[PDB]
């Protein structure tokens, strides 16, 4: 497990030959380190070229652009820089991808779009923005990716709390295999890969079986440690993970992080049969989709709540009056119980006092919710508690599996414990993974990615964010009436 | 027309007889005043009920439901309240709409118009909302709110009306039943919803006139038991409205009207106006969902705006890049602009732009003469603002620009510094557009019998006008790329101190 976490993926001393790197002390822009693969391009030796002014390499026009872009700077949205390299053959040019990190400066060379193009992306974005829900937004995101990257398969993979994931949307060309609901374990994106991706959000491997060029030399020329190659686009990628890809059987891979409030939310993973490369530009457009999709994630969240303000208004009104006039509160509840229970996805709900309990629907008896309450107190919040699987973190609960696998708990008090608990019952479901996910490898890639299935119990259906808000708006009501009457 | 503005619509002495008003001195909730039409429900007469336990008129449960609602105090979202009124003739059930104002309590009773609101209804508004939220652009979204409103209120015609800088507006979306006359795109003058109306509508967002030919029951009496003045029915739903307007409506062919305000950043943005040929009433519960649609619509306007921006990062990011690299790297900034000009212009949606200092001018595209921009910029200096300036008709505020109207009626002026010495101006040329009106907008009223200024004009047929002197509207997103372009010019210029 944690052995997977421990590799340095950021320092390999190597790259991907579909491009050419350089490191520079900037003052006159002297090549402080360069990559092996350079020789096929200028036909000269390798360490010879160290401490050499880059500029005589660059057509006049080009060289000047480089220098400016460095302090060009506004707003470090200088990439890509169109360069032309002076050479033995004659006129041939590049896209240049420059960055600074750890007091050294890196420049990478990569291969070189119209009014028709922007429009393609504009409409990508429109569709995404007008998506009705999250599953649908993800799909639009997958295909618009697919459409503009020409890849055989796009997946939107979203992390679960445990850093296991699930492919929640896919789009593939006719005659390409599918991973469309598959889960995969945390081993698959180790804690370090993950954390790198949270700040470097796009990466590509245009041929998964590349010829790794190393660096002449591999040292930081101004701080003298290992070269930290994190924000290099050409940074050669862990061999571990590499065979992994011939295993899936895809001869190219790209992926764009989905980052949401600085926590990685998921990835767009992209697979093609033949090797394939697409220009920086397209990856940029991809990242801009990925971005929009991230933003949408929340607007869909706000929207889902609104869609449901209506029962809510109505129910408030009823609930209000129906509790309003009766000579008991506890009574007043019973009457609206069902529509409420129905509003929440729920089979039952309790109110546990220090001094008793009021139970409604499918719940555990009076004795044991007070047990449940007692337990709730310790948790490292006095805010809402929620889960689909109670017994995961409360093994005393495996018994209510049948009727409370899922619990929503809302305190009335600002930090008081007199609570409203909503229960939901088990719902068995079947999840499919890569292979025996109890056998994910530490060592190399596991052999197989064919569907493997597993029967989960003691778990309720997920709590939707908006049902939570209604719990709250409901506590808000019982709170008021509870107050109004002393 | 400031007299049209002076008619005080919140102090009539009457209500609309489809409902019954009250007002109560509050402890024992004794009745302090009522409307004439009360007579029809309780064969007794006004004064026989003045100052009495209102609850004497209610069932055990209703009275308490009311009383418990008197400090209901769950927001003021207690409305409507099921009241059951005891009567001579058989039993009578009302929707009760309680509110406080001018130091008193007012209660109104309106017809319950589902004896049950259902699960089918909830889904209908849910899908109304989903649609409204997934709209592609402001028009479509306006339209959606219209049809969905239409689906649940059933009125023959639903309009979305959007106000402009002068309090004229135009119908920008409409949905109607077959064979109902269309006022889509019709402009209307500010006179038609006069200032005071607008004000009330800004703080009171829904109103209905279920029959435009009603017999206004007045109130016995019209004295506030705590303030003794005339009674304020501002937030009374039942409030008999201006008769000026009432005539507007027969003159319009519609014997019922409901309208929900669209209120955005505490300014009246527009109205959803609903019209039916023959009278119609719709229940409190139904108006409330309409208001809910409007609010979803109100919010959606901004999401739409934001969305329109995001959609345009790409030309932007591009021009940004080509710019940085192409424009720094040419040995003039002037020279740089020269190049990226058309794309810029194209992104800007503009025929021309310049960069005048106090000490020079750099013009690109089709612009005014240098002398003429040099003067624009002086004038721009006296304005009391230092931010973006925008007009579709420059000559309206700067009449000396009439001359260049043909090539710059629209100006988007954006300052480099906070010191507004040197600015980047974008030009757009007058454009022909033909717009159509309610009636002639040049006599928006006529003198009524006895010599006053309150008659609605006789007709709302298309009147058309050719307008040639105003440019294309400056769009929110366009302004943004201007700001962004500015930001780039700045770096170069800064970068190049020396
Ligand atoms: C503990 C070693 C590893 C096991 C076992 C394993 O399965 N992976 C292991 C290490 C790494 N994976 C790296 C990158 C990476 N992994 C994925 C995994 C997926 N690709 C998919 O398409 C899906 C699901 C549909 C999954 C779960 C991706 C997308 C990536 C990023 C690159 C890409 O595939 O496009 C990785 C990082 C190496 C590095 O970046 O240097 C390691 C170490
Ligand atoms: C200055 C005298 C008035 C003229 C002339 C006039 O046209 N209106 C005048 C006064 C009032 N109008 C009132 C309410 C009101 N007006 C409108 C106007 C429109 N309705 C439409 O559908 C369109 C265009 C398609 C327009 C321009 C509306 C919508 C309303 C609100 C009621 C409704 O929905 O019909 C008014 C207020 C009376 C009150 O509320 O007491 C006054 C005084």
- What are the chain B neighbours of A65 within 8 Å (beta carbons)? 325, 329
Neighbour count for residue B18 (Cβ, 10 Å): 18
Q: Which residues pair with A159 in a beta bridge?
A: A165
> How far is B313 from B146, CA to CA, in rounded Å?
31
Nearest CA to ligand 2 atom 17: B193
> How far is A1 from B217, CA to CA, in rounded Å?
81
**Residue B252 DSSP code:** T
Query: Residue A212 class from Cβ within 10 Å (0-12 exposed, 13-18 middle, 19+ buried)?
Result: middle
> How far is B474 from B390, CA to CA, in rounded Å?
7
> How far is A191 from A185, CA to CA, in rounded Å?
12
Distances (CA, A) of B444 to B194, B226, B269: 11, 41, 22
Angle ∠(B60,B65,B66) on CA atoms, nearest 5 = 105
How remote is the CA of residue B9 from the centroid of ligand 2, in Å?
Answer: 12
> How far is B103 from B225, CA to CA, in rounded Å?
9
Enumerate helices (H) and strands (E) in chain B, giving the number of each. 13, 22
Does residue A237 line the site of ligand 1, with CB under 6 A? yes
- What are the chain A neighbours of B61 within 8 Å (beta carbons)? 325
- The token duo for B273 is 């106006």
> How far is B440 from B433, CA to CA, in rounded Å?
17
Asked if B68's CB is within 8 angstroms of A310's CB, the reply is no
- The token duo for A257 is 């992080």
Task: Kindly report the nearest CA distance between residue A122 and chain B, in angstroms.
Answer: 5
Query: Is the distance from CB of B260 to CB of B290 less than 8 angstroms?
Result: yes
Angle ∠(B428,B349,B432) on CA atoms, nearest 5 = 50
Nearest by CB to B68, from A68, A74, A324: name it.
A324
Q: Crossing angle, helix A280-306 and helix B284-310, to 10 degrees?
A: 170
Distances (CA, A) of A382 to A374, A410, A471, A474: 12, 9, 15, 18
> How far is B34 from B50, CA to CA, in rounded Å?
8
- The token duo for B286 is 């139904």
Nearest in space to B282 (alpha carbons), one of B147, B162, B156: B156
* End-to-end Cα distance, chain B: 61
> How far is B307 from B310, CA to CA, in rounded Å?
5
Q: Three-class SS of residue A114?
A: coil
Task: Kindly report the nearest CA distance between residue A149 and chain B, in angstroms.
Answer: 17
Nearest in space to A240 (alpha carbons), one of A458, A440, A472, A86: A440
> How far is B140 from B124, CA to CA, in rounded Å?
19
Query: Residue A104 class from Cβ within 10 Å (0-12 exposed, 13-18 middle, 19+ buried)?
Result: buried
- The token duo for B439 is 């009636």
Residues 6+ apart with CB under 8 A from B33: B22, B23, B50, B219, B220, B221, B222, B223, B225, B231
Query: Is the distance from CB of A425 to CB of A402 less than 8 angstroms?
Result: yes
Long-range contact set of residues A412-415: C-beta below 8 Å, sequence gap at least 24 = A412/A475, A412/A478, A412/A479, A412/A482, A415/A382
Listed in sequence order, the DSSP H helices in A130-258 are: 134-149, 191-197, 239-248
Query: Residue B47 class from Cβ within 10 Å (0-12 exposed, 13-18 middle, 19+ buried)?
Result: exposed
- What are the chain A neighbours of B317 within 8 Å (beta carbons)? 77, 284, 288
Site residues for ligand 2, CB cut-off 6 Å: B 4, 7, 9, 159, 161, 171, 183, 188, 191-194, 197, 207, 241-242, 244-245, 248, 257, 259, 271, 273, 444-445, 454, 456
Nearest by CB to B491, from A74, A308, A310: name it.
A74
Residues 6+ apart with CB under 8 A from B327: B333, B336, B337, B339, B340, B488, B492
CA of B82: which chain A residue's CA is closest? A321
- The token duo for B13 is 């002495």
Residues 6+ apart with CB under 8 A from A197: A189, A203, A257, A264, A267
Angle ∠(B289,B290,B293) on CA atoms, nearest 5 = 90
Distances (CA, A) of B124 to A6, A308, B130, B153, B293: 55, 11, 10, 12, 11
Q: In what order do the strands lie in the sheet with A14-15?
A: A14-15, A213-216, A30-35, A20-25, A104-110, A92-101, A81-85
**Substitution target from A67, A69, A72 for chain B, most B beta carbons within 10 A:** A72
- What are the chain B neighbours of A470 within 8 Å (beta carbons)? none
Residue at token pair 């305000």: B261
Query: Is the distance from CB of B235 to CB of B29 less than 8 angstroms?
Result: no
> How far is A229 from A227, CA to CA, in rounded Å?
6
- Provide the experimental method for this PDB entry: X-ray
Asked if B77's CB is within 8 angstroms of A129's CB, the reply is no
How remote is the CA of residue A241 from the centroid of ligand 1, in Å?
Answer: 5
**Residue A450 DSSP code:** S
Q: What is the DSSP string of B455-483?
A: EPPS----EEEEE-S--PPPPHHHHHHHH
> How far is B178 from B35, CA to CA, in rounded Å?
39
ω into A381 cis (within 30 of 0): no
Angular region, B29: left φ>0, alpha ψ -120 to 50, beta rest:
left
**Substitution target from B72, B73, B324 for chain A, most A beta carbons within 10 A:** B324
**Residue A100 DSSP code:** E
Query: Is the distance from CB of A260 to CB of A111 less than 8 angstroms?
Result: no
Question: HSE of A246 in the Cβ direction (CA atoms, 13 Å)?
Answer: 9
3-state DSSP helix/strand/coil % of chain B, to nearest 5: 35, 25, 40
Q: Which residues pair with A226 in a beta bridge?
A: A219
How remote is the CA of residue B248 from the centroid of ligand 2, in Å?
Answer: 7
> Which helix (H) or strand (E) element contains residue B48?
none
Query: Is the distance from CB of B496 to CB of B333 less than 8 angstroms?
Result: yes
Would the CA dihedral through B26, B30, B35, B41 be positive or negative?
positive
* End-to-end Cα distance, chain A: 57
Mutating to test ligand 1, I would choose from A193, A253, A450 the residue with most ligand atoms within 8 A of its C-beta, which is: A193
Query: Is the distance from CB of A289 to CB of A144 less than 8 angstroms?
Result: yes
Q: What is the DSSP string of B401-445?
A: GGGGGGT-SEEEEEESSSSTTSEEEEEE----EEEEESS-TT---
Among all bound ligands, the one having the nearest atom to the CA of B171 is: 2
Mutating to test ligand 2, I would choose from B13, B248, B268, B282 the residue with most ligand atoms within 8 A of its C-beta, which is: B248
**319-348 of B, contacting A, C-beta below 8 A:** 320-321, 324-325, 328-329
Query: Is the distance from CB of A247 to CB of A239 less than 8 angstroms?
Result: no
> How far is A103 from B327, CA to CA, in rounded Å?
28
User: How many residues in total does chain A contain?
Assistant: 486
- The token duo for A418 is 């007199």
Query: Is the distance from CB of B401 to CB of B415 less than 8 angstroms?
Result: no
Query: Is the distance from CB of A208 to CB of A251 less than 8 angstroms?
Result: yes
Beta-sheet strands, E only, within A56-212: 81-85, 92-101, 104-110, 153-159, 165-172, 183-184, 202-205
- The token duo for A96 is 């240049």
What torsion do the CA atoms of A178, A180, A185, A189 make, to the nearest 10 degrees? 80
Count Cβ–Cβ pairs < 8 Å, chain A vs chain B: 118
Task: Mark B210-236 as b/e (b = at least 16 C-beta within 10 Å).
Answer: bbbebebbebbbeebbeeeebbbbbbb
Nearest-Å Rg of the Cα atoms of chain B is: 29
Chain B interface includes A25 (CB < 8 A):
no
Q: Three-class SS of residue B80?
A: coil
Angular region, B245: left φ>0, alpha ψ -120 to 50, beta rest:
alpha
Distances (CA, A) of A275 to A205, A270, B426: 9, 12, 47
Query: Is the distance from CB of A61 to CB of A71 less than 8 angstroms?
Result: no
- The token duo for A445 is 């890639």
Residue at token pair 């700001």: B483
> How far is B442 from A160, CA to CA, in rounded Å?
66
Does residue A434 line the site of ligand 1, with CB under 6 A? no
Nearest-Å Rg of the Cα atoms of chain A is: 29
Q: What is the DSSP string of B81-122?
A: EEEEE--SSS-EEEEEEEEEETTEEEEEEEE-S-SS--HHHH
Angular region, A175: left φ>0, alpha ψ -120 to 50, beta rest:
left
Would the CA dihedral through B240, B241, B242, B244 be positive or negative?
negative
Q: Which domains does chain B have, with CATH numbers?
A: 1-7+118-214+243-309+431-469 (3.30.450.40), 8-117+215-242 (3.30.450.20), 310-430+470-498 (3.30.450.270)
Q: Crossing angle, helix A115-129 and helix A134-149, to 10 degrees?
A: 170
Q: Three-class SS of residue B360?
A: strand
> How far is B252 from B270, CA to CA, in rounded Å?
20
Residue at token pair 């026009």: A61
Please state the φ and ψ torsions of residue B32, each to the nearest 5 degrees. -100, -15
Residues 6+ apart with CB under 8 A from A94: A82, A83, A84, A85, A109, A110, A111, A112
> How far is A426 from A420, CA to CA, in rounded Å?
20
Enumerate helices (H) and strands (E) in chain A, giving the number of each. 13, 20
Query: Is the distance from CB of A362 to CB of A403 less than 8 angstroms?
Result: yes
Neighbour count for residue B433 (Cβ, 10 Å): 12
Neighbour count for residue B322 (Cβ, 10 Å): 15
- What are the chain A neighbours of B117 within 8 Å (beta carbons)? 314
How remote is the CA of residue A187 from the centroid of ligand 1, in Å?
Answer: 9
Residue at token pair 């060289």: A63
């Amino acid at each position: 497990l944690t052995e997977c976490d421990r590799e340095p993926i950021h320092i390999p001393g190597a790259i991907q030959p579909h491009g050419y790197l350089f490191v520079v002390s900037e003052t006159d822009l002297r090549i402080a380190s360069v990559s092996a693969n350079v020789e096929d391009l200028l036909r000269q030796p390798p360490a010879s070229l160290l401490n050499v002014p880059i500029a005589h390499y660059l057509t006049a026009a080009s060289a000047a652009r480089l220098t400016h872009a460095l302090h060009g700077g506004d707003p470090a949205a200088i990439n890509p820089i169109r360069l032309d390299v002076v050479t033995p053959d004659g006129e041939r040019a590049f896209n240049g991808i420059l960055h600074r990190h750890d007091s050294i400066v890196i420049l990478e060379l990569e291969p070189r779009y119209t009014n028709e193009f922007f429009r393609s992306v504009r409409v990508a974005i429109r569709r995404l923005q007008t998506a009705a829900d999250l599953p649908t937004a993800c799909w639009i995101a997958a295909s618009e990716v697919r459409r503009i990257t020409g890849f055989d398969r796009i997946k939107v993979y979203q992390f679960a709390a445990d850093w296991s994931g699930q492919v929640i949307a896919e789009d593939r060309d006719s005659g390409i295999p599918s991973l469309l609901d598959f889960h995969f374990p945390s081993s698959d994106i180790p804690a370090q890969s993950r954390a790198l991706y949270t700040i470097n959000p796009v990466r590509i491997i245009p041929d998964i079986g590349y010829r790794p060029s190393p660096l002449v030399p591999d040292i930081n020329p101004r701080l003298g440690g290992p070269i930290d190659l994190s924000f290099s686009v050409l940074r050669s990628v862990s061999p571990t993970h590499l065979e992994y890809m011939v295993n899936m059987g895809m001869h190219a891979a790209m992926s764009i992080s989905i980052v949401r409030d600085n926590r990685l939310w998921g990835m767009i993973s992209c697979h093609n049969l033949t090797p394939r490369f697409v220009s920086y530009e397209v990856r940029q457009a991809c990242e801009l989709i990925a971005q929009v999709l991230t933003w949408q994630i929340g607007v869909l969240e706000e929207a889902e709540i609104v869609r449901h303000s209506v029962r809510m208004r109505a129910i408030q009104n009823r609930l209000l009056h129906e509790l309003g006039d009766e000579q008991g509160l506890t009574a007043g509840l019973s009457r609206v119980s069902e529509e409420m229970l129905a509003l929440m996805g729920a089979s039952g709900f309790a109110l546990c006092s220090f001094d008793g309990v009021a139970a409604f629907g499918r719940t555990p008896s009076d004795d044991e919710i007070q047990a449940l309450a007692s337990w709730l107190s310790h948790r490292e919040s006095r805010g809402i508690f929620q889960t689909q699987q109670l017994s995961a973190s409360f093994p005393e609960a495996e018994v209510y599996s049948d009727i409370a696998s899922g619990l929503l708990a809302v305190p009335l008090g600002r930090a008081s414990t007199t609570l409203m608990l909503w229960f939901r019952p088990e719902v068995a479901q079947t999840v499919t993974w890569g292979g025996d996910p109890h056998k994910p490898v530490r060592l190399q890639t596991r052999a197989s990615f064919e569907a493997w299935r597993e029967e989960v119990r003691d778990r309720s259906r997920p709590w939707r964010s908006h049902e939570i808000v209604a719990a709250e708006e409901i506590r808000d009501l019982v709170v008021d009436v509870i107050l109004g009457r002393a």
